[PDB]
Design a protein around this ligand. Sequence first.
Ligand SMILES: *C(=N)[C@H](C[C@@H]1CCNC1=O)NC(=O)[C@@H]1[C@@H]2[C@H](CN1C(=O)[C@@H](NC(=O)C(F)(F)F)C(C)(C)C)C2(C)C
Ligand SMILES: *C(=N)[C@H](C[C@@H]1CCNC1=O)NC(=O)[C@@H]1[C@@H]2[C@H](CN1C(=O)[C@@H](NC(=O)C(F)(F)F)C(C)(C)C)C2(C)C
Lengths: 306, 306
Amino acid sequence: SGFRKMAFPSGKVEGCMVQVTCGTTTLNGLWLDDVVYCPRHVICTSEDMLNPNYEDLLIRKSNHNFLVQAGNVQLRVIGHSMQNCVLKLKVDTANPKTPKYKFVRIQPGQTFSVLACYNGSPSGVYQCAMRPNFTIKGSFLSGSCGSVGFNIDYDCVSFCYMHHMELPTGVHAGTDLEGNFYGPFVDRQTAQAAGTDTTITVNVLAWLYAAVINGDRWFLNRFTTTLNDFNLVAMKYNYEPLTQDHVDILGPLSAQTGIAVLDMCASLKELLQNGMNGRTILGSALLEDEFTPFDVVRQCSGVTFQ
Amino acid sequence: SGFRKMAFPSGKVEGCMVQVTCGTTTLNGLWLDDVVYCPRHVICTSEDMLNPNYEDLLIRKSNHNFLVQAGNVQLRVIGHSMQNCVLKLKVDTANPKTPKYKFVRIQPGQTFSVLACYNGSPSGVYQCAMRPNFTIKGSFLSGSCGSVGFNIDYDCVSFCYMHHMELPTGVHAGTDLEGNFYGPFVDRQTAQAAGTDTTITVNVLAWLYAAVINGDRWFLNRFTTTLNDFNLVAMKYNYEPLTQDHVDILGPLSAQTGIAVLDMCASLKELLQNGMNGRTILGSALLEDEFTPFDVVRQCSGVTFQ
Ligand SMILES: *C(=N)[C@H](C[C@@H]1CCNC1=O)NC(=O)[C@@H]1[C@@H]2[C@H](CN1C(=O)[C@@H](NC(=O)C(F)(F)F)C(C)(C)C)C2(C)C
Ligand SMILES: *C(=N)[C@H](C[C@@H]1CCNC1=O)NC(=O)[C@@H]1[C@@H]2[C@H](CN1C(=O)[C@@H](NC(=O)C(F)(F)F)C(C)(C)C)C2(C)C
């Protein structure tokens, strides 16, 4: 029983983390085989921050301008190249702690664990979701850049996020491990704002199923709804549109509970109208949207309380 | 900026988790030096757990009766003994991945990270608080027993919890690593209930300081109170007494924010009496009590461990 915002065990990612210094700028690197991946803005100065020409900044760099440190051991850079918004540093040593890995670009609503690091050293691990507006609600301070988001499937670490910047609203923006930003953001200190955020409807429905699996049913009602009527109401509370794809993905959780997806949709529709009335669901007074259908099936029972 | 429920990096513990099998029962073990620590009820059959005599059950067991599996290698047991509610299995090999560590017994309201494991394999990591009623609000299915709770002190892991059982309210009970239960519980399949819990007042105030640091301020007030008037209100809402210790411990947060402890106690008093008036604090509609003063200072000032 119980339900937690559970993170993946971080050990496979800790083993990859390095410190990268260019001039006075220090941030975190990801060391996989004989390549260190980091945010390209490690090569920026204070004057460069607004309108950096990265190609012009990089061309003035030698390999020995990059100081890469794995623990107290200095790695030796034998090559550098830029791919979109990531710097790729070729080093003379393959990381002996390299896990089975792959680079995946995730879609809004997808979750992952973040290993917040400073000076290539881990500070903590927490669970995040890619917001519909392509931000994450992270916990990042100075020196956290190059921190990475990941999932783990058996022994394989799928890297999906590298941290670049904080937006005015206190929310975070970053790239996949191929250096392409999520959302319309750019690695410049020019004025940028996150678009108005929405609630991840497919995830709230999953979390309500988790509540039923763990034996809570108070929020259920005797109603159903059409997919369209649900979306017309849901959009009025700043909820993501629920697609047929989302309904298909909730199929397994429907079967385990015996509650049709659109029956669960009628329950959510009621909760948005009524609030909580001093009650909680899985120890929350808000509808939680940072658990995916996969997260629920992973953490929850094959059986239900019932 | 940003504030997240953050676990310690789990890598140092991932390297210590093994699978322990006795007859048909399988659960998780902690492999440190040449000793494997696990719940003593691994020697029990499903029907022995009714009224187990662990003294009697163990004296009938031999070393080869304990199948201990680290990854793909079977370890050989050269001795077995009980300490309170934990079984200690002497093995042929000192764990080469053994971190610097100690066994620590924690107080209610103190937090730790739990590495959830199944068949000696880490599944997930989350942050917990020792409840005042000596339970944890964990997330545990069948086979999670022997999963451990820990804190990291620079490079030293302090082991504080071993998972033993789930109460009918869906909360969790276990021991320190010396096999002494937290709370009035016994490792028997007999009727047992969690005592009425209470809120950890020092943690809520600490969390309000984190909210202030991260720019959420609407709940502050011009009033002050005395400790004694606050505790009169606190106990009315089943909040823990706030001692002078607590006020001294929130010292480093009070000066750094410029908000006096008893002024923040005045803000808390108002939140309990009035509720939150449709508003949230760090994206929560409840008062969070699972962040310690130390936790807030540590996340908000960055950090590293080795
Ligand atoms: C990496 N070490 C930091 C991480 C930041 C610092 C505070 N919290 C974080 O997540 N990243 C940066 O310093 C990036 C970096 C220059 C400035 N920057 C920012 O995050 C800034 N924000 C923006 O420029 C904005 F608004 F456009 F997003 C800052 C004002 C410092 C928060 C570059 C090259 C984008
Ligand atoms: C260890 N692998 C499990 C973990 C449990 C299983 C369900 N969720 C968990 O957290 N521990 C147990 O199976 C322990 C074990 C016998 C019974 N038990 C329980 O957790 C049971 N509860 C109680 O005995 C109670 F209520 F008294 F606390 C159960 C009914 C299976 C939930 C022993 C020896 C205590």
